[PDB]
Design a protein around this ligand. Sequence first.
Ligand SMILES: Nc1nc2c(ncn2[C@@H]2O[C@H](COP(=O)(O)OP(=O)(O)O)[C@@H](O)[C@H]2O)c(=O)[nH]1
Ligand SMILES: Nc1nc2c(ncn2[C@@H]2O[C@H](COP(=O)(O)OP(=O)(O)O)[C@@H](O)[C@H]2O)c(=O)[nH]1
Ligand code: ALF
Ligand code: ALF
Ligand SMILES: [Mg+2]
Ligand SMILES: [Mg+2]
Lengths: 425, 422
Amino acid sequence: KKAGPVQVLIVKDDHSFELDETALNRILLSEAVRDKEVVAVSVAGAFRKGKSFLMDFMLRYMYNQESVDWVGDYNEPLTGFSWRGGSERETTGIQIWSEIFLINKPDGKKVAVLLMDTQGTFDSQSTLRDSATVFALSTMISSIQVYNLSQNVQEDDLQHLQLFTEYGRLAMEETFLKPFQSLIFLVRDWSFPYEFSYGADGGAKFLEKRLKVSGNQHEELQNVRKHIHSCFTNISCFLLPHPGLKVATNPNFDGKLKEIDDEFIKNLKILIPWLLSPESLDIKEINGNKITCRGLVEYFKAYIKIYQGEELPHPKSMLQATAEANNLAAVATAKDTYNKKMEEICGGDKPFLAPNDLQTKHLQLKEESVKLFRGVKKMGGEEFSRRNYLQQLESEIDELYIQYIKHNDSKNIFHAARAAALEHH
Amino acid sequence: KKAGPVQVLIVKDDHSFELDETALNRILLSEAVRDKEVVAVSVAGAFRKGKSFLMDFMLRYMYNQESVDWVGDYNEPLTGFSWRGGSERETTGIQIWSEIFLINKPDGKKVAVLLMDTQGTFDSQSTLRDSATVFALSTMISSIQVYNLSQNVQEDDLQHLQLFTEYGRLAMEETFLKPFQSLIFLVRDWSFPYEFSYGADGGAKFLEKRLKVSGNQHEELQNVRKHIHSCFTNISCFLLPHPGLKVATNPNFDGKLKEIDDEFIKNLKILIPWLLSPESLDIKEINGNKITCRGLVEYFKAYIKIYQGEELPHPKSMLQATAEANNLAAVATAKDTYNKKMEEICGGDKPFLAPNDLQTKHLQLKEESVKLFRGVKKMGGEEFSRRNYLQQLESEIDELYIQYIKHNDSKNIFHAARAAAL
Ligand SMILES: Nc1nc2c(ncn2[C@@H]2O[C@H](COP(=O)(O)OP(=O)(O)O)[C@@H](O)[C@H]2O)c(=O)[nH]1
Ligand SMILES: Nc1nc2c(ncn2[C@@H]2O[C@H](COP(=O)(O)OP(=O)(O)O)[C@@H](O)[C@H]2O)c(=O)[nH]1
Ligand code: ALF
Ligand code: ALF
Ligand SMILES: [Mg+2]
Ligand SMILES: [Mg+2]
């Protein structure tokens, strides 16, 4: 059996997740690797952006780093993880390479290298939770996360990175250390080498500016950068040239280097050993402990079990989350107002109210609190409120009303009995 | 007296917005155009994606429409709205062309055409509110919005469009009609003509598949699409080839067609008249009324005034907004828990409680509700909860306690004169 890609995290059609433990155990629990300290390299980011393609050049280096020309014969097609053109996603879930690479580090340590390829985020078959779970899991498992971006590092990219890494952090053991190790902002099709050079040095200068935290920036900009810095012990950036229009657009392209732009190739041959050379391979650490292949299986099972449950808050889009916050805040105000107004008429220090007098004032105050809730301008507007929050508000007000019923009754328990006795009299 | 770009929506370093009303009035209130029905064409989308570059080719068409060679001499630099390479944003706010084009529609109606160029969203200096205000205002003002995207239409693109259009709808008057008119998904650097042909027909098939609502689709995917369809009376899509690496990467490139990929040019010459030909020009309508240039000016002013205040909720990042929702929900659960636990000992059907016992049970139940609040897993971290919600929750529980003191005291009454009489 030849080495090949192995699907380990499956996303089902109903957006539930399954770990193929058998497949994962077969690769990571073999006698040759299971007790080896593990290096886990992942690539993640927006879909359809060359992630699998890049990983297959990483495989070439992993297999041929001892040869003079690891990058390959210029007529050799690019194989391994499945990659292709087209606007529909190819990789789903998380796949790993079936052959764990045993690599000697300069300090004599023999480490196991795992390569992890991921479903691109934001394809139109996936919920936000699907995309967040894949990104979070790949970040939580990897010791090197290659965050693959197109053309630029935009503010929505940083917000997505923040959301996905937060989602990962929420599923992890509490720790005083940073949750993750190495992040690489890999910018595909960097177009401004005259501004910042292709490679890791122009990348570092670009990203140093782009991620810099200033106490004088708007807190929204500050906090996304603070978050990202807090998550990773090392953050780097590599700017890659466009690979040429043949790579991007020719359907007959199959990965041959003779059809890839030369400056892309030069930088690819710098990028890959920079990421993967024996010196650069950071052993995976979780909660301050170096992890073996066997222990990584355990964390993969632990982490996925959390995401298969419902302990964590659901990832929400900007509009959904803001609409919910807007509605939650207005429900609280409307209910608080109903409470305070009811206290004015049937608080503990107020006289007993006849039941239909209490009912009249409750119905009026309930209506006033519903009109107040409805009047608050909220994202998603009236339709989202009515379907998801109005019934909750009216129901909770009703509950408060029944409490006030009992409070009020307590002040004159014989009201109805005495009334009936007196009506006869 | 040369036409040029005019900054009308000014964005300041403090993230405030200013309308240059003098400049806007000078352009759209002149005698020749003030009473004409207006067509407003905007381009909007992520920053650094060639929006101003595109609009400058729109300018060439708008001036040289009658000519077969409107695209220009192949040695002519591209001028108009400022465009350039570099990773840092150039256009800010909203600028318009100072010359309003007068066009005869096929039915003989003469309309005024306004061209709007916008600050790309998500640049490194902008809050989400900044980006949403620009995108929403340009959508609310334009009758044709070219949503300029790079390479593909991704689900986050649809979510951004939903957020920005929702933010626009929030500032508009209630209506029984769709709020906006024409939207064009312009996919720059479309790389898969073997899957969907370059141009409008390939774009239509591609976008139809992207925006289709299906019954078996997760409702989160359904809902963003239903929103987008509910917002626009016409949604189309154009797939544009990459312009060539020189356009993308050469710092001396200045817009000469001779340095632009011929297949890009071929589709560009189809795109611009497809967008801007007299038949294509959609007269701006707001809530079912066609708008004039003078009417459009008032809406510029009215809409920005709404965004300049705080009547509306602010757009927030996914994490910020989720953290707030998570904490608001946990606060409500904590207080609701305290309420129901207090009802078990001081509800109307419970006996009078000695004040010291009530205090002790309050203190315990408050602490339980605070522990509940703090233990609930939330986005944003424990410090966000502690700094922004914990003390208010404790204070609100303290207020509820006082209500319960009064309910409890009502159960221990003694009237000395009544007792001595009894
Ligand atoms: N524009 C561009 N295209 C690339 C690059 N690298 C690979 N491609 C092309 O991008 C497409 C998607 O590749 P793939 O690895 O399957 O993307 P993935 O979905 O992110 O894994 C293929 O057609 C590749 O030839 C790049 O750096 N820039
Ligand atoms: N890749 C690519 N670059 C383009 C395209 N159109 C223009 N450009 C380049 O994009 C860069 C930014 O253009 P500009 O109009 O200032 O972008 P804007 O910020 O969206 O207004 C310039 O270097 C243009 O030469 C396109 O279709 N594809
Ligand atoms: F679109 Al992909 F791996 F991100 F096929
Ligand atoms: F980056 Al821009 F106009 F969107 F300069
Ligand atoms: Mg892939
Ligand atoms: Mg611009």
